[PDB]
Design a protein around this ligand. Structure first.
Ligand code: HEM
Ligand code: HEM
Ligand SMILES: CC(C)(C)OC(=O)N[C@H](CS[C@H](Cc1ccccc1)C(=O)NCCCc1cccnc1)Cc1c[nH]c2ccccc12
Ligand SMILES: CC(C)(C)OC(=O)N[C@H](CS[C@H](Cc1ccccc1)C(=O)NCCCc1cccnc1)Cc1c[nH]c2ccccc12
Lengths: 452, 448
């Protein structure tokens, strides 16, 4: 099974028996994809254990996998487990079950539903400032993924359930404590190492009631939703019930995906943005000059005022270029196809290296440098939407893209209106990415906060 | 009563006595709303006779009228008469009668009931192609609304009653096309407006706007169609608190809407596809990709076609067949920072908002890329309202969108459309009452 790409004439690193090419992950998925992109070119193949993975970098071929042949061939992602009841999660569901859940949860993030969240999100933006004002009036360096994480959890628990959990913190809020340990794919752990190298034990662990998400975390989330479901305004929890009037299980599964996504992805990218704004004070000042122009006298940010800020979107877009927290896009080829003049066998996992494409010198000038001017309307036209895919593409893209982009901008504004950010020497410069599994910094992002 | 907007400080054209502002309708409702939107920015008021009409364009205020305070203040549309037994129609009913009829007729267009209609609709799509193949093998220019209307009547009479009607000269299409034509030159719907206080006279006089020998003919056909689950069956089960009349009133609305709205928009779409062959070809390339070897369109393959939805959405932007949205303010309110008196008709100029330069780049041009997933997030759902919004929105929106798409697929799979010189280019909209072309849409049909 390790002679598939040798047969197809597709280059790639020589796989070791059983392991495949997983030993090359010692520097992370990023550095492995960047090296393979330069070593073999537009298309290469490798093996995660006994599983062949074909990597494509052609925009037309990426457009075919993500959009053109999504419903017919490239519908599902790589099988993930053991998940237990989480198999019904929208990000894990396959084929028919995903198509029903995608249409059920699509009206959650419309332009109207999002516009209803702006007055609600505006509350915790002040709690975010008041919590930062305490750590700013006393010169105390600030870890950001904590103060950004507490704000993100308050938004997702209210925009989707209408409940207030962290009521001004409450820094040991149980949701944030449990959600931060819902899952950390560490390749050092021999669990996830075996899960990939040896994939036939997943049915063993499924009947063994084993779950990658710790039982103490799922329970706390499983019983909180049953606590949140007691008897409106029409949000994520409401859409599921009015159509349930689904099950008590699949309803909990989708809530866990929304709670994690709204917390981890929002807080991590916000920490990546503030690091770039601190290391580039010229960009931070120019961004502060635009916020004061659209919103004078520290005016509260509204739905339309956020979409007007051109430079705020450029800072968000450039940071998502350097740090695509998804790293990769994966689709499982469900049947034999010949896309763009290339045969792809059934079962092959088609992977799009987003991190490698976002830093390809053949597309970006000085790819390692933070330059928000890449996304200006003077130059945003010179960017392929299939090379820069921070939220994916096609029918199975990021469903909370418009919500995540709005909320992050609502937090950036209401912060940069009151504070400027400076490094602290105890701040890691340059920022090392996590050489482990997920895209995070090695040392947590710390920065000095000064009040304006 | 002509100093209401002068009192409230709301701008608007100076009304003439009795007439009000109706003599500005000489260019149509659409050109009157576009001019008033540019001169009387954001909010303006005018009079349809002695009836004050407040026009709003703010998305937050439109959302408040159509959605938030719909059940409480803005529940009913403008009063219309004389109507007779048609007062029990869902689109004419008011307050309690509408709420019961809206809940009664809503399950007609669920995702399951619509999915049941695809195998039935797929029959007349072949008859639509076979009737077009005769007028295509001979080089005869085709009147699109004629061949599109015969298909629309077959669908509504089977999806709602289960009867097969159109095989040429069909009595249903012939009568339904005459059911109502609001012509402002025509002096009845006119005086009805300048003089709305004689509507009661003609009521106790048994008089109506829909021709007697059109209503009778629809009135006896339903009694003929009722002999022993669809739109018809849903009501007889609640009759066994509908009556032998209110059931007939709802059937007339479903038959008219399923015929005129479907055929007219389908004609508007094929005109834009013939005047923009690049969009027509690009749409044909997507249909052959989702449905290879001319595969029959099913429920799921229709919702997959992204470009087909973008073409339908852009055509509905340029030609919103309803033109306006109207709600009657039933009690004094102060919405979004503006006082509105009781009895004022709140109007949303859909045609004017769909072509507003503060919202659309080159609004007069046909660009389906406005509704691509990349850009459709620039579109306010309260500016682009081809089916309205709120609890009293278009109840047959999901049915009309599938039916038109099911017809566009089967037609574009077999034929390409070209102008015929005798085709009106550019297309003039009807300067009269309803949104239609002046000259009928004629195009050349070539077989692939
Ligand atoms: C900076 C913030 C975020 C980024 C960069 C991001 C990125 C992504 C990407 C790249 C994908 C996969 C797309 C593909 O495979 O083509 C994805 C999927 C998904 N995202 Fe996000 N996301 C973010 C925030 C959020 C938020 C706030 C939510 C809230 C619910 C969310 C929910 C989801 C879900 C449910 C999926 C799976 C969709 C499916 O399988 O159909 N994401 N995200
Ligand atoms: C392209 C096709 C169509 C368009 C653009 C359209 C548009 C509209 C609009 C704008 C309204 C007014 C909504 C409001 O005032 O908020 C409406 C109402 C209505 N439509 Fe249509 N429509 C179409 C086809 C149909 C079809 C096929 C039916 C089949 C039954 C239908 C039945 C109705 C009914 C019954 C109402 C009144 C609902 C009520 O008053 O509660 N329409 N439509
Ligand atoms: C490399 C690792 C093992 C880390 O992840 C995977 O391999 N597990 C998925 C298959 S289920 C996945 C399971 C999950 C649930 C909660 C927290 C974390 C993990 C899931 O539910 N995820 C969406 C959760 C919320 C979210 C996150 C980020 C952005 N938006 C929303 C496959 C996958 C690999 N990379 C991806 C990038 C995007 C989407 C899916 C994947
Ligand atoms: C400018 C004029 C006077 C022409 O029209 C109005 O002012 N009279 C209505 C108040 S009753 C209206 C009466 C009616 C009934 C059958 C056929 C035609 C007319 C009615 O029931 N029509 C719905 C029939 C089904 C349908 C048609 C089109 C699209 N979808 C469904 C006010 C009104 C203005 N625009 C509208 C759009 C939809 C519904 C009502 C209105």
């Amino acid at each position: 099974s390790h002679g598939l790409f040798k047969k197809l004439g597709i280059p790639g690193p020589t796989p070791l028996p059983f392991l495949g090419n997983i030993l090359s992950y010692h520097k992370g998925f990023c550095m492995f994809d960047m090296e393979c992109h330069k070593k073999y070119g537009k298309v290469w193949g490798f093996y995660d254990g006994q599983q062949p993975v074909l990597a494509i970098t052609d925009p037309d071929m990426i457009k075919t996998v993500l959009v053109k042949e999504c419903y017919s061939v490239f519908t599902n992602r790589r099988p993930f487990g053991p998940v237990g009841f989480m198999k019904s999660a929208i990000s894990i569901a396959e084929d028919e079950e995903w198509k029903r859940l995608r249409s059920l949860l699509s009206p959650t993030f419309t332009s109207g539903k999002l516009k209803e969240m702006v007055p609600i999100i505006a509350q915790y933006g002040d709690v975010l400032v008041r919590n930062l004002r305490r750590e700013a009036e006393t010169g105390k360096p600030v870890t950001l993924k904590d103060v950004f994480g507490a704000y993100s959890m308050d938004v997702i628990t209210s925009t989707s359930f209408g409940v207030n959990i962290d009521s001004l913190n409450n820094p040991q809020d149980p949701f944030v404590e449990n959600t931060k340990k819902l899952l950390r794919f560490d390749f050092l752990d021999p669990f996830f190492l075996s899960i990939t190298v040896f994939p036939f034990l997943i049915p063993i662990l499924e009947v063994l009631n084993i779950c990658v998400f710790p039982r103490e975390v799922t329970n706390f989330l499983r019983k909180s939703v049953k606590r949140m479901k007691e008897s409106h305004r029409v949000d994520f929890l409401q859409l599921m019930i009015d159509s349930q009037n689904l099950s008590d299980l699949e309803l909990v599964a989708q809530s866990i995906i929304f709670i994690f996504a709204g917390y981890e992805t929002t807080s991590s990218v916000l920490s990546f943005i503030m690091y770039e704004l601190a290391t580039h004070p010229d960009v931070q000042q120019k961004l502060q000059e635009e916020i004061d122009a659209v919103l004078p006298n520290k005016a509260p940010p509204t739905y339309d005022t956020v979409l007007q800020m051109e430079y705020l979107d450029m800072v968000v877009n450039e940071t998502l270029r350097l740090f695509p927290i998804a790293m990769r896009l994966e689709r499982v080829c469900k049947k034999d196809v010949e896309i763009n003049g290339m045969f792809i066998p059934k079962g092959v996992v088609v992977m799009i290296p987003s991190y490698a494409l976002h830093r390809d010198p053949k597309y970006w000038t000085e790819p390692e440098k933070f330059l928000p001017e890449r996304f200006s309307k003077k130059n945003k036209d010179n960017i392929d939407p299939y090379i820069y895919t921070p939220f994916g593409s096609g029918p199975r893209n990021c469903i909370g893209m418009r919500f995540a982009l709005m909320n992050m901008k609502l937090a950036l504004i209401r912060v940069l209106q009151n504070f400027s950010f400076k490094p602290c020497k105890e701040t890691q410069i340059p920022l090392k990415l996590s050489l482990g599994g997920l895209l995070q910094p090695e040392k947590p992002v710390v920065l000095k906060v000064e009040s304006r």
